[PDB]
Amino acid sequence: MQVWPPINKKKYETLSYLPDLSQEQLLSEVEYLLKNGWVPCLEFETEHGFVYRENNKSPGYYDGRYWTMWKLPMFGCTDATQVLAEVEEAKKAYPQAWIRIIGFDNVRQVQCISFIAYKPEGY
Amino acid sequence: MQVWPPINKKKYETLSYLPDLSQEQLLSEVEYLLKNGWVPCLEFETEHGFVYRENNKSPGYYDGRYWTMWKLPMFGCTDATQVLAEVEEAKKAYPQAWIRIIGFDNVRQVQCISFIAYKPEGY
Amino acid sequence: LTYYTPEYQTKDTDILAAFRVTPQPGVPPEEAGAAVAAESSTVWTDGLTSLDRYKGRCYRIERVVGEKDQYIAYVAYPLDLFEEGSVTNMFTSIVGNVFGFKALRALRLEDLRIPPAYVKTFQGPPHGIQVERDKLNKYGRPLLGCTIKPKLGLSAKNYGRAVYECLRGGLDFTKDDENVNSQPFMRWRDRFLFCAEALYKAQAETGEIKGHYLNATAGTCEEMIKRAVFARELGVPIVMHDYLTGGFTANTSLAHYCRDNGLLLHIHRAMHAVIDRQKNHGIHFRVLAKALRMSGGDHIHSGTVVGKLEGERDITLGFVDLLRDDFVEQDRSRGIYFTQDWVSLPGVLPVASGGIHVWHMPALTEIFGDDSVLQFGGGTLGHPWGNAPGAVANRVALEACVKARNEGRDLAQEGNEIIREACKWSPELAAACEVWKEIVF
Amino acid sequence: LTYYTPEYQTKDTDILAAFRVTPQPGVPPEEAGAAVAAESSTVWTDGLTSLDRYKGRCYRIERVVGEKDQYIAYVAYPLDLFEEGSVTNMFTSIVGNVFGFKALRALRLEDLRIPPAYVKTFQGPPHGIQVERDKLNKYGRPLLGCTIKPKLGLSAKNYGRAVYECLRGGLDFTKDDENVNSQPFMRWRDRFLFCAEALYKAQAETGEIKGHYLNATAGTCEEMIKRAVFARELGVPIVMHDYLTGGFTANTSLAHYCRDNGLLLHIHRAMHAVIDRQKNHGIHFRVLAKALRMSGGDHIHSGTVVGKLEGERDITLGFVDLLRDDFVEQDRSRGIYFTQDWVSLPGVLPVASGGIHVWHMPALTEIFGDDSVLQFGGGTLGHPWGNAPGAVANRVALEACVKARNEGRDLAQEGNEIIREACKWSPELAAACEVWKEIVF
Amino acid sequence: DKLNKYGRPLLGCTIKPKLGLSAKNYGRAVYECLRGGLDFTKDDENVNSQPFMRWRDRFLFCAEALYKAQAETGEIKGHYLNATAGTCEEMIKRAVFARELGVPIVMHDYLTGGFTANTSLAHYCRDNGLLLHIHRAMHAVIDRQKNHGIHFRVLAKALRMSGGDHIHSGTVVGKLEGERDITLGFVDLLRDDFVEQDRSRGIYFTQDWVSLPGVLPVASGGIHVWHMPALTEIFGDDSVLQFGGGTLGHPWGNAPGAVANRVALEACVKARNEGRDLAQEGNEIIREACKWSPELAAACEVWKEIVF
Amino acid sequence: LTYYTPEYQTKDTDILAAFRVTPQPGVPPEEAGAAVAAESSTVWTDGLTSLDRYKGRCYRIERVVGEKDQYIAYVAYPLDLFEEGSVTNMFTSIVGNVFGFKALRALRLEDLRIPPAYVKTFQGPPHGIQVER
Ligand SMILES: O=C(O)[C@@](O)(COP(=O)(O)O)[C@H](O)[C@H](O)COP(=O)(O)O
Ligand SMILES: O=C(O)[C@@](O)(COP(=O)(O)O)[C@H](O)[C@H](O)COP(=O)(O)O
Ligand SMILES: O=C(O)[C@@](O)(COP(=O)(O)O)[C@H](O)[C@H](O)COP(=O)(O)O
């Protein structure tokens, strides 16, 4: 029986409870993404890595949900290597960043994929 | 006449104004508990050791009241040594923890015992 | 005869009253008991309605073997006489005209048995013992209260200084005096504000949750809820009401407001002894206590056992159990004339006040046990080094009476020794009982 | 000593209390009277405030020459203790804790002198005698009331039949029983509606203005005003409240509503004898009557003098005058322990109830005079031809006791003859007192 | 969007027993379960306000547990506070205080509550920002017998129109492929804008929803960790998978039973994204994920015994 | 067993239900009646509360002498399950999930006995026959 640690296990939603993804794993997720036709895009954040409620507390308002867009949505990306190149760009650009890959399903106008790609030290 | 120090005397409710309990004292409390039929259970906390009101201030809302359950309620504990073993587990697991023992009176569905068992440095 | 029916088999939806009746000078118990029943119910064109459906029935006479002309008459009243949810109409229908009936000399109401089909029409406590402990996070030890003194006279900034000092010492509650309402020397809103400031300071300091009973009794229903509303607004946990001068109508309104807004209600029994002291006329306190569990309050003043004989102590524990328990069996020993099922109405935590001192701690921890508030006025305050260490004094006293009880020690015997060995590690507690050392040790 | 100050010169803005105190077994009057004063006021850091400014002072001891240990202690209380306009806080500060003080055996509050600077903080009657007579157009004769019976049991359509019948006979008022509130057999709104129908029918028929006291007592402040509001809505002239089970807080709210909406308030003293019967412990009724003139009502139940000795009859007339008059001088004969200036607060019309019968008419017309309501339950109702002619019975009886008084005849003597010659021209009145002819004539 | 949860079914958890528990206790249960990885915890369909747990105390203690969990995890949490009440007034009163604590979702039993009342609670949620979770209590009095009554897809359609954001769709666990197809007929009626007539899955009429928003479906009862790949494939990403006995029934307690259920699902998702087939590789998927989670291991120890 | 208690003596503040139950194909009345009771009430850490205080009890089985597998099970429910004045919560607690229980074939609720301590929490008719007349 273990006690699940109350401290230091902050998650970043989808797939953040499996082991940290290998680049072949990253890649396959970016490939899936592309295989369904979803636009990749990168997002990143240097200071509020997790939801907070600074400006209002009414039902459903949270601050921290938006992150900064890293460059543009990669419209017509054809190989997932393009996406991965970008994560390696942002990490060297921003080693304090939290970086995540999102994917748009323009037609149903929903965002439909999300998973983190890089974290700062001790996260 | 002494002035009761305004700083550094933060309490943890029941029995926290007597001297810190010896393991024979701890033990006798866990024995009492068992002698009345109350389920022991351990609870612990690493960061908000004391009530605060972060999320609402209406009559009776306080944050910090819940702590993390350490393992499970020890249903059918028969010797208080089982409980004490656990506190020694949690302390080595968590030396920044505040650890407390609580005891349920399932029948009157009230919690009916509480007292702290371990504190972090300089508490 | 029409209102004395020894024949009678009581219905489970019937309100039974045990009235101690002392007849005149040549009036048989049988007529006394039947006049009591006639007069707390009916009289005429019962061929246009039915007398028998709505009549109160005197169905039993006992003789109180001891006194003169004292009898215990048992009257049974139809559930259809009573307006659901109105203690005001329970008391107007039972005690409204019989006590002035010329053929009796004195009459006292000793107990009422409130049937489950009428208990369910009442809200009762806005929260009750279990929730209150939960809300406040206070478990395994009586809760400690403190009286701010003088009664009248003090100013709002001053009252708040008193309150902070007492609360940071270890009590969990401080109390607006039963009659500080709003007066030329302390208007309510200023008091409420300065005490909300002192109580949050104390809490921030100790780490334990604090409360101050802000007295919302007022001369109108409107002014009373206005006060309640601003305590709601500062986010403070408990307001207080004097239910007997305030009245039953108004306290059911303040109790509904507390339920709906999250505030604990502490009740003060001011004026009870105008009603419940003489042993031959009036209403016994356990009937006034029962009417507060039904009207609604979370705390109520139960009195003290300090300096009470074991016979007294048992009627006290009879009605403390009526306040906290779901089922209380008839036990004429402690005055429980009727078994009472409370069908889960929450229990009222009892407050032991007046004359209580530190060295009385083991007796009150054993006579009342964990579900009570022990209220020191002169204890906290009367301590010579001031009231924050008088609060420490009173808090270590009690946490030693608890530790000891848990270790199996006997508080009835080891009491004076318990407190004695705890004085050794608390100058606060030492100082607190220095004269008592002189008489006792 | 600190609370027994025979030195004291009372301030015109002081509330004086005359408490009859019976000390224990070895407690001098001087300590009794001073404990009474200490306990209905103060105790400690009066070097942070001032004890002397807010202390109650026992400034006089009398011995009641007659009884055992009875004394009359006179206590004086500062006007700054009292919350303006709150009878609830007057009673909590005076009668809130002293009656249970162990060093006294019994304690009774006999009178309170309410200083003009506190009388002006209270509204008092929403209308009072002069306005009520005006509003209703009823002048020169006591107003006649009628009780609808049985107490409980009857239905709304039935109650209204009773009401119409009684009112068209000549009474001016009919009364919701003190405890018909809203029950399984008659919910309030149906009652109010059927009685508004019967009372307008009666009025249309007679040509005189009618009223029915609709009882707005309820278990919450809210439900009470809800009832008041619908009586306002049917345009009916009077609602009623049971001020002592209802409570002082709630009745000041119903009295303010009546003032603001034009409705007369009739008050019923249900539960008073739990408080005011024993002659050695409690509160005397003239103190409960005074607290209703100040809390507010236009009518209040004063009792009956039927079958009362001339000594009783005089304490009754002492407090009837406290209810109707602007200045009442101290007259220890009729129990008026203090002179009372009412600084123009309106007077409460008194209601004489229970046991009243037609042949008691000349005594009540002479003992109470024109400013009163004479209330027949069993009179109206108990008449054998039914209650509209029982109303005629009671109305000619009274208009003959008035005519006669105006002609100089003496009601104390000619009473039985007055009514006798009026029976000659009213079969109604004849029938009404046929057994009384048998005993008397 | 509101919740920031994308690419994986949302996980719910039932607090048990149904009745019986106290408010402080319910909140302890709720915190424990939520910090483990579920995103929602559920007021039982019939905890309204009773002698053992009056509503406002429950709402307050659960608002405390759910913010604690969220502060701890970093993910947004919610607890369906059940606002069903015996009058329209008492129902909106409850809704209003959930609005007041800033909490994201209330719940209603639409069929015992009634259609009139639920259109009122749905308008209030729209106007105040709260998600509505619906429970289909009493449906089988109406929809079970195959020859008299109203089929559930007609009761589901009347909730998309009356209004709710989540509704109980049932389970496919232990359902034959013929059943599974009528279930997927009405799940699509709930989520989709255009559903063509397909008498196979019981879609007797084509339905155009002219952009009315879709109701996310909730799969409840009997669901266990090893059923994860089937439900991730039968329902896909737009659903709430609700474990009562899953979360709770785990032997080490319910925060690791929540981890148990959360890694199970994030492995059924990763695998699907890698092209693996959940219909076949299911038992193996979960099997290789048990290797790096004692939580998940412990969670399916008896299932190892029968299967592996 | 836990939910089939023929032992049981019904309390005057208990809501009794007479459910006509038709079990499957190899399910004894005794299990049917006890599943009905389990499912219109409770299940787990009843060592943190008490199962026994809040459990629905199947305290009687009759056989409807006439039909196939029809029985009349009598279930007893604690007054503490019920929210005063809410027919909505009476029906959600009794008929809310048992009729779809797979081990029964059909289930019908035939009568409910509503104890006086719950009848008094309801207003009932705004006026009723006598007033209306
Ligand atoms: O309310 C109280 O707390 C009492 O008024 C008890 O009243 P009851 O008769 O109405 O129950 C108190 O005795 C004093 O104000 C404090 O006493 P002390 O200074 O000795 O501690
Ligand atoms: O309120 C009344 O009117 C009384 O209750 C007096 O009460 P108080 O003690 O409270 O003043 C009445 O006596 C009866 O109901 C009518 O008597 P009857 O039939 O003889 O005329
Ligand atoms: O609402 C639910 O969540 C159900 O009541 C499904 O109802 P429907 O028939 O109304 O859709 C649940 O099965 C149990 O309470 C949990 O099951 P478990 O412990 O097996 O996970």
mmCIF file of N, CA, C and O in Angstrom, chain D residues 101-150:
data_model
loop_
_atom_site.group_PDB
_atom_site.id
_atom_site.type_symbol
_atom_site.label_atom_id
_atom_site.label_comp_id
_atom_site.label_asym_id
_atom_site.label_seq_id
_atom_site.Cartn_x
_atom_site.Cartn_y
_atom_site.Cartn_z
ATOM 1 N N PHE D 101 -30.939 33.849 41.601
ATOM 2 C CA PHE D 101 -29.849 34.103 42.526
ATOM 3 C C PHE D 101 -30.170 33.343 43.788
ATOM 4 O O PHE D 101 -31.213 33.545 44.394
ATOM 5 N N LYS D 102 -29.203 32.502 44.168
ATOM 6 C CA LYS D 102 -29.345 31.535 45.242
ATOM 7 C C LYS D 102 -29.529 32.114 46.626
ATOM 8 O O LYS D 102 -30.038 31.454 47.526
ATOM 9 N N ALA D 103 -29.087 33.350 46.831
ATOM 10 C CA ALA D 103 -29.236 33.971 48.123
ATOM 11 C C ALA D 103 -30.602 34.578 48.368
ATOM 12 O O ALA D 103 -30.878 35.134 49.442
ATOM 13 N N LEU D 104 -31.493 34.507 47.390
ATOM 14 C CA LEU D 104 -32.838 34.987 47.612
ATOM 15 C C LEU D 104 -33.619 33.691 47.518
ATOM 16 O O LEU D 104 -33.078 32.680 47.087
ATOM 17 N N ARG D 105 -34.855 33.660 47.981
ATOM 18 C CA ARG D 105 -35.702 32.474 47.963
ATOM 19 C C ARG D 105 -36.728 32.612 46.865
ATOM 20 O O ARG D 105 -37.156 31.702 46.173
ATOM 21 N N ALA D 106 -37.266 33.784 46.781
ATOM 22 C CA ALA D 106 -38.205 34.089 45.755
ATOM 23 C C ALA D 106 -38.012 35.581 45.528
ATOM 24 O O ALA D 106 -37.402 36.250 46.368
ATOM 25 N N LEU D 107 -38.406 36.086 44.360
ATOM 26 C CA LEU D 107 -38.274 37.498 44.020
ATOM 27 C C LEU D 107 -39.372 37.739 43.029
ATOM 28 O O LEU D 107 -39.656 36.880 42.168
ATOM 29 N N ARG D 108 -40.010 38.857 43.240
ATOM 30 C CA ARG D 108 -41.078 39.256 42.377
ATOM 31 C C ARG D 108 -40.815 40.705 41.935
ATOM 32 O O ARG D 108 -40.311 41.467 42.746
ATOM 33 N N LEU D 109 -41.064 41.136 40.681
ATOM 34 C CA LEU D 109 -40.928 42.491 40.207
ATOM 35 C C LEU D 109 -42.273 43.130 40.381
ATOM 36 O O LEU D 109 -43.235 42.700 39.734
ATOM 37 N N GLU D 110 -42.425 44.149 41.207
ATOM 38 C CA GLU D 110 -43.763 44.669 41.395
ATOM 39 C C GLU D 110 -44.074 45.829 40.492
ATOM 40 O O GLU D 110 -45.210 45.848 40.022
ATOM 41 N N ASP D 111 -43.144 46.772 40.228
ATOM 42 C CA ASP D 111 -43.405 47.949 39.377
ATOM 43 C C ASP D 111 -42.114 48.439 38.764
ATOM 44 O O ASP D 111 -41.016 48.118 39.254
ATOM 45 N N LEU D 112 -42.227 49.183 37.679
ATOM 46 C CA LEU D 112 -41.058 49.752 37.017
ATOM 47 C C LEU D 112 -41.509 51.167 36.801
ATOM 48 O O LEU D 112 -42.693 51.371 36.498
ATOM 49 N N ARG D 113 -40.644 52.155 36.943
ATOM 50 C CA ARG D 113 -41.042 53.499 36.642
ATOM 51 C C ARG D 113 -40.231 53.766 35.400
ATOM 52 O O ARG D 113 -38.987 53.728 35.424
ATOM 53 N N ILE D 114 -40.961 54.092 34.347
ATOM 54 C CA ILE D 114 -40.285 54.325 33.101
ATOM 55 C C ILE D 114 -40.222 55.838 32.821
ATOM 56 O O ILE D 114 -41.184 56.585 32.641
ATOM 57 N N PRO D 115 -39.009 56.346 32.855
ATOM 58 C CA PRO D 115 -38.759 57.745 32.789
ATOM 59 C C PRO D 115 -39.183 58.357 31.457
ATOM 60 O O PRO D 115 -38.994 57.687 30.423
ATOM 61 N N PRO D 116 -39.689 59.589 31.304
ATOM 62 C CA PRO D 116 -40.043 60.127 29.999
ATOM 63 C C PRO D 116 -38.956 60.044 28.919
ATOM 64 O O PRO D 116 -39.341 59.717 27.810
ATOM 65 N N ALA D 117 -37.654 60.193 29.153
ATOM 66 C CA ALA D 117 -36.640 60.091 28.118
ATOM 67 C C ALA D 117 -36.484 58.657 27.559
ATOM 68 O O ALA D 117 -35.796 58.449 26.546
ATOM 69 N N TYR D 118 -37.099 57.625 28.167
ATOM 70 C CA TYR D 118 -37.123 56.290 27.558
ATOM 71 C C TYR D 118 -38.533 56.008 26.972
ATOM 72 O O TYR D 118 -38.684 55.372 25.918
ATOM 73 N N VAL D 119 -39.621 56.496 27.583
ATOM 74 C CA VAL D 119 -40.948 56.366 26.999
ATOM 75 C C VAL D 119 -40.959 56.926 25.571
ATOM 76 O O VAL D 119 -41.518 56.288 24.699
ATOM 77 N N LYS D 120 -40.296 58.056 25.277
ATOM 78 C CA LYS D 120 -40.188 58.663 23.932
ATOM 79 C C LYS D 120 -39.388 57.912 22.857
ATOM 80 O O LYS D 120 -39.437 58.239 21.661
ATOM 81 N N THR D 121 -38.596 56.927 23.254
ATOM 82 C CA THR D 121 -37.988 56.113 22.276
ATOM 83 C C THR D 121 -39.048 55.039 21.840
ATOM 84 O O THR D 121 -38.681 54.225 21.012
ATOM 85 N N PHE D 122 -40.316 54.885 22.263
ATOM 86 C CA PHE D 122 -41.170 53.801 21.897
ATOM 87 C C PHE D 122 -42.359 54.326 21.214
ATOM 88 O O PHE D 122 -42.891 55.347 21.590
ATOM 89 N N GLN D 123 -42.891 53.577 20.261
ATOM 90 C CA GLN D 123 -44.064 54.019 19.545
ATOM 91 C C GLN D 123 -45.301 53.855 20.424
ATOM 92 O O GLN D 123 -46.129 54.772 20.523
ATOM 93 N N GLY D 124 -45.433 52.682 21.072
ATOM 94 C CA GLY D 124 -46.584 52.421 21.894
ATOM 95 C C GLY D 124 -47.687 52.012 20.974
ATOM 96 O O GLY D 124 -47.446 51.527 19.864
ATOM 97 N N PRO D 125 -48.909 52.164 21.386
ATOM 98 C CA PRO D 125 -50.063 51.720 20.660
ATOM 99 C C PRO D 125 -50.037 52.149 19.220
ATOM 100 O O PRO D 125 -49.729 53.299 18.979
ATOM 101 N N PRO D 126 -50.339 51.341 18.214
ATOM 102 C CA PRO D 126 -50.369 51.831 16.872
ATOM 103 C C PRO D 126 -51.484 52.872 16.749
ATOM 104 O O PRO D 126 -51.479 53.666 15.802
ATOM 105 N N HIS D 127 -52.485 52.960 17.643
ATOM 106 C CA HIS D 127 -53.593 53.915 17.486
ATOM 107 C C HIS D 127 -54.126 54.326 18.842
ATOM 108 O O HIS D 127 -54.258 55.513 19.030
ATOM 109 N N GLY D 128 -54.503 53.495 19.821
ATOM 110 C CA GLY D 128 -54.921 53.969 21.132
ATOM 111 C C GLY D 128 -56.409 54.322 21.142
ATOM 112 O O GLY D 128 -57.024 54.517 20.073
ATOM 113 N N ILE D 129 -56.982 54.470 22.342
ATOM 114 C CA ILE D 129 -58.391 54.711 22.587
ATOM 115 C C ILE D 129 -59.105 55.791 21.795
ATOM 116 O O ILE D 129 -60.172 55.552 21.217
ATOM 117 N N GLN D 130 -58.554 57.000 21.780
ATOM 118 C CA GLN D 130 -59.188 58.131 21.137
ATOM 119 C C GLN D 130 -59.322 57.902 19.642
ATOM 120 O O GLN D 130 -60.383 58.168 19.083
ATOM 121 N N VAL D 131 -58.258 57.406 18.972
ATOM 122 C CA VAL D 131 -58.250 57.179 17.538
ATOM 123 C C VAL D 131 -59.146 56.040 17.242
ATOM 124 O O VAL D 131 -59.922 56.180 16.316
ATOM 125 N N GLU D 132 -59.024 54.939 17.984
ATOM 126 C CA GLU D 132 -59.850 53.797 17.746
ATOM 127 C C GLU D 132 -61.329 54.178 17.800
ATOM 128 O O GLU D 132 -62.081 53.839 16.880
ATOM 129 N N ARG D 133 -61.776 54.941 18.785
ATOM 130 C CA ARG D 133 -63.146 55.373 18.836
ATOM 131 C C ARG D 133 -63.577 56.176 17.634
ATOM 132 O O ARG D 133 -64.709 56.097 17.135
ATOM 133 N N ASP D 134 -62.613 56.954 17.164
ATOM 134 C CA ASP D 134 -62.798 57.820 16.022
ATOM 135 C C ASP D 134 -62.951 57.087 14.717
ATOM 136 O O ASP D 134 -63.956 57.295 14.025
ATOM 137 N N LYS D 135 -61.966 56.216 14.471
ATOM 138 C CA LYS D 135 -61.883 55.344 13.331
ATOM 139 C C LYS D 135 -63.156 54.540 13.227
ATOM 140 O O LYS D 135 -63.720 54.463 12.124
ATOM 141 N N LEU D 136 -63.570 53.930 14.367
ATOM 142 C CA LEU D 136 -64.763 53.103 14.426
ATOM 143 C C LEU D 136 -66.085 53.837 14.632
ATOM 144 O O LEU D 136 -67.112 53.218 14.370
ATOM 145 N N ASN D 137 -66.159 55.107 15.090
ATOM 146 C CA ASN D 137 -67.358 55.915 15.286
ATOM 147 C C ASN D 137 -68.287 55.495 16.423
ATOM 148 O O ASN D 137 -69.526 55.672 16.438
ATOM 149 N N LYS D 138 -67.616 55.003 17.472
ATOM 150 C CA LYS D 138 -68.238 54.329 18.605
ATOM 151 C C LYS D 138 -67.878 55.215 19.765
ATOM 152 O O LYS D 138 -66.665 55.392 20.057
ATOM 153 N N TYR D 139 -68.942 55.825 20.363
ATOM 154 C CA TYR D 139 -68.728 56.790 21.448
ATOM 155 C C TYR D 139 -69.790 56.722 22.554
ATOM 156 O O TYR D 139 -70.984 56.622 22.274
ATOM 157 N N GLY D 140 -69.364 56.735 23.826
ATOM 158 C CA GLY D 140 -70.258 56.756 24.957
ATOM 159 C C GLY D 140 -70.793 55.429 25.436
ATOM 160 O O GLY D 140 -71.981 55.349 25.722
ATOM 161 N N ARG D 141 -70.032 54.365 25.558
ATOM 162 C CA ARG D 141 -70.542 53.077 25.952
ATOM 163 C C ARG D 141 -69.346 52.205 25.763
ATOM 164 O O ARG D 141 -68.513 52.467 24.889
ATOM 165 N N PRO D 142 -69.188 51.213 26.617
ATOM 166 C CA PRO D 142 -68.083 50.296 26.480
ATOM 167 C C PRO D 142 -68.292 49.569 25.140
ATOM 168 O O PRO D 142 -69.444 49.515 24.655
ATOM 169 N N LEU D 143 -67.233 49.053 24.492
ATOM 170 C CA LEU D 143 -67.365 48.344 23.237
ATOM 171 C C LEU D 143 -67.624 46.905 23.684
ATOM 172 O O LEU D 143 -67.008 46.461 24.679
ATOM 173 N N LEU D 144 -68.508 46.155 22.991
ATOM 174 C CA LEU D 144 -68.814 44.765 23.327
ATOM 175 C C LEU D 144 -68.104 43.773 22.393
ATOM 176 O O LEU D 144 -68.304 43.837 21.163
ATOM 177 N N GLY D 145 -67.382 42.793 22.941
ATOM 178 C CA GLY D 145 -66.705 41.722 22.185
ATOM 179 C C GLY D 145 -67.367 40.334 22.332
ATOM 180 O O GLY D 145 -68.195 40.137 23.223
ATOM 181 N N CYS D 146 -67.061 39.295 21.555
ATOM 182 C CA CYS D 146 -67.741 38.015 21.708
ATOM 183 C C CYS D 146 -66.770 36.932 21.404
ATOM 184 O O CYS D 146 -66.011 37.114 20.455
ATOM 185 N N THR D 147 -66.750 35.837 22.141
ATOM 186 C CA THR D 147 -65.771 34.790 21.872
ATOM 187 C C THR D 147 -66.393 33.730 20.999
ATOM 188 O O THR D 147 -67.576 33.493 21.202
ATOM 189 N N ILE D 148 -65.713 33.136 20.009
ATOM 190 C CA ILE D 148 -66.330 32.131 19.154
ATOM 191 C C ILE D 148 -65.898 30.825 19.837
ATOM 192 O O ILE D 148 -64.706 30.705 20.191
ATOM 193 N N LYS D 149 -66.823 29.858 20.113
ATOM 194 C CA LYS D 149 -66.445 28.589 20.755
ATOM 195 C C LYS D 149 -67.044 27.363 20.066
ATOM 196 O O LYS D 149 -68.146 27.475 19.485
ATOM 197 N N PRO D 150 -66.381 26.168 20.106
ATOM 198 C CA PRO D 150 -65.145 25.816 20.840
ATOM 199 C C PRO D 150 -63.804 26.474 20.507
ATOM 200 O O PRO D 150 -63.737 27.248 19.562
#
